[PDB]
Amino acid sequence: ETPPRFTRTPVDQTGVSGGVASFICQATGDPRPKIVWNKKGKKVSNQRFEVIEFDDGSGSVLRIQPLRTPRDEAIYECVASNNVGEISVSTRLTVLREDQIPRGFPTIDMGPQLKVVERTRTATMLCAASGNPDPEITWFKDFLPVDTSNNNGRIKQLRSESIGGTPIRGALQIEQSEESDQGKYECVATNSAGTRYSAPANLYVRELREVRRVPPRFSIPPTNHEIMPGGSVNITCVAVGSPMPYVKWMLGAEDLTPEDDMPIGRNVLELNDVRQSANYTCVAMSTLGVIEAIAQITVKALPKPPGTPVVTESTATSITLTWDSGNPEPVSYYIIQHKPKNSEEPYKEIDGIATTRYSVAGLSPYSDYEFRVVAVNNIGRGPASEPVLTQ
Amino acid sequence: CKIRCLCEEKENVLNINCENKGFTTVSLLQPPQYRIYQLFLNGNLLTRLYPNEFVNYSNAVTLHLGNNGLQEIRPGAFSGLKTLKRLHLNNNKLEVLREDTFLGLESLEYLQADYNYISTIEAGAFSKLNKLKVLILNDNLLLSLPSNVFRFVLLTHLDLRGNRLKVMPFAGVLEHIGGIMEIQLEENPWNCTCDLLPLKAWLDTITVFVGEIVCETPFRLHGKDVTQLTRQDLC
Ligand SMILES: *[C@@H]1O[C@H](CO)[C@@H](O)[C@H](O)[C@H]1NC(C)=O
Ligand SMILES: *[C@@H]1O[C@H](CO)[C@@H](O)[C@H](O)[C@H]1NC(C)=O
Ligand SMILES: *[C@@H]1O[C@H](CO)[C@@H](O)[C@H](O)[C@H]1NC(C)=O
Ligand SMILES: *[C@@H]1O[C@H](CO)[C@@H](O)[C@H](O)[C@H]1NC(C)=O
């Protein structure tokens, strides 16, 4: 066991009526000491005097607000005790009227302001104070003094350095803010003439907002088209992301979209009187990259006339026909035309012959006939073939 | 307090944590009546708030209503929140701020309503909220701001980031601002034409300003920070 020992003793204060005065006291020992505040050996008890303990339990701050004069003018004592011992220290409070405030007494020219900081961001409370002599600035939070002794810590106080024709600047800098940093801050200016408090300023801690950046993405990638010669078509391109991406159309190297008139997030290319096939690139760009996607325009030509049919197998009531497609492009299917030779009527048609061979059945015996071949794909019905005569 | 909710006696006030308990209504729990406290109600599925639903929370300092999927606040819901100071409404589904929505409060100085899908605020919404000093509305759907919204308050912090703002006029909206310490306009679709000049000008007259305002429109001015820009670059 060890008796109590002060690590922080209170100092005489001269404050201004209506204002605040605070006395700070801290002690150590084993067991941990308690602290009481007295006046003339009787424990203080007054609506305007509040005692606020340190969370660690080491000390207490006696705060008086609003100051009254001569009421509050007095000697007060901090007494630290345990079962091993007791120690006390005296201190004086003086309170001046505003009409007897001296020239030079510190003034608060500008005080800390309501501030909202995102968690983990830096918050700076500010104070501008002046006086004669030029005063020192200290800080209280939720009625307890701010500790910034450790220059090497999260909360730092900054210099001015030398003012001057204006007031002295004090800064309270709180890096890596957390919920516990939230609270009511006051800046305090002190010189040999006395002590003055700022108005209070609250600090709020808002949850960190993370700028959602998203690289561009083809929301509606252009889809390929095939059409007949001239020939119009509207191909649409859509990009998304943060920031929103500009969308231009290109024909290989050339830009189609004029530069100074270039839409955001959506560009529909209007193509008119299409002549030949074309690869068409669509480029979306943000500050976070450049992406491109092609659109396959093609011009399909409905079938050429098929290559003349040939008679491979002929029976009394059937005639087998083998031909060539007569086409470069895939022929989806073939339609065979048939009628009598001296007949002067529309050709009878057999449909859906998916191959280049087919046996026309049902014919009369010893009867002549004239045959033709008509090609079909997706686009349209190609012209017939040069006819074959047979029996 | 304790049965369907967790209460931590904080050093100064009382912390009541009814977070994420899937309450659809505030009918069930009896708050304390004479003790000052904070109430966390995040992660509770209530579609709507009903008129005078809150009445017995005379003394509640802060109230959190985030991640609740809120859709509407029927006229004058916060009827009894006499001494409320801080309010959160984040991450819900609110599209309109009716003028009579915040009927109850006289004492509130903080309002957070981020991520909420608000397309159109009404003018008289924040009227009769004198004490309000902080307004947070980022990541919403604000295309335009009804004039004289801020004429009756003098807030110091206004967050309008991540909204859908292209222009901001001096007449009405802006002349009331200027008393602010901080303002945020960071992630907005700013269309930098001569029609965006007032804002620009107002940004020189305003003091203690920090943040970037990059031109979304047009392509020529893409990325350029308006503050760096000039009146001739704009005309
Ligand atoms: C392309 O879009 C324009 C714009 O309305 C329209 O007038 C035209 O008919 C469209 N053409 C096609 C082939 O879709
Ligand atoms: C278009 O591009 C494809 C490859 O994606 C290529 O095979 C084709 O020959 C090109 N055609 C034209 C007309 O550019
Ligand atoms: C509030 O308390 C009063 C007291 O009688 C009661 O009648 C009323 O139903 C309560 N309302 C709510 C929402 O708790
Ligand atoms: C940008 O402003 C110009 C003129 O100020 C206007 O013509 C144009 O439509 C605007 N663009 C957008 C996307 O608001």
Residue numbers in the entry:
A (entry chain A): 28 to 418
B (entry chain B): 29 to 263
Task: Reproduce text from the manuscript describing this model.
Presynaptic type IIa receptor protein tyrosine phosphatases (RPTPs) (PTPδ, PTPσ and LAR in mammals) can induce synaptic differentiation by binding to various postsynaptic adhesion molecules such as IL-1 receptor accessory protein-like 1 (IL1RAPL1), IL-1 receptor accessory protein (IL-1RAcP), netrin-G ligand-3 (NGL-3), neurotrophin receptor tyrosine kinases C (TrkC) and Slit- and Trk-like (Slitrk) proteins. All Slitrk members except Slitrk3 can induce both excitatory and inhibitory synapses, whereas Slitrk3 selectively induces inhibitory synapses through binding to PTPδ7. PTPδ expressed in the developing brain consists of three immunoglobulin-like (Ig) and four fibronectin type III (Fn) domains in the extracellular region, where two splice sites exist within Ig2 and between Ig2 and Ig3. Peptide insertions (termed mini-exon peptides) at these two splice sites (referred hereafter to as meA and meB) generate splice variants of PTPδ.
After optimization of the length of PTPδ-ECD, we finally determined the crystal structure of a complex between Slitrk2 LRR1 and PTPδ Ig1-Fn1 at 3.35 Å resolution. The asymmetric unit contains one complex, where Slitrk2 LRR1 binds to PTPδ Ig1-Fn1 at a ratio of 1:1. Ig3 is spatially separated from Ig1-2 by meB. Slitrk2 LRR1 comprises a central LRR with seven parallel β-strands flanked by N- and C-terminal caps, which are stabilized by disulfide bonds. The concave surface of Slitrk2 LRR1 surrounds two strands in PTPδ Ig2 and meB (234ELRE237) with a buried surface area of 644 Å2. Asp167 and Glu215 of Slitrk2 hydrogen bond with Arg236 of PTPδ (the third residue of meB). Slitrk2 LRR1 also interacts with PTPδ Ig3 with a buried surface area of 450 Å2. Therefore, the present structure clearly indicates that binding of PTPδ to Slitrk2 depends on meB but not on meA.
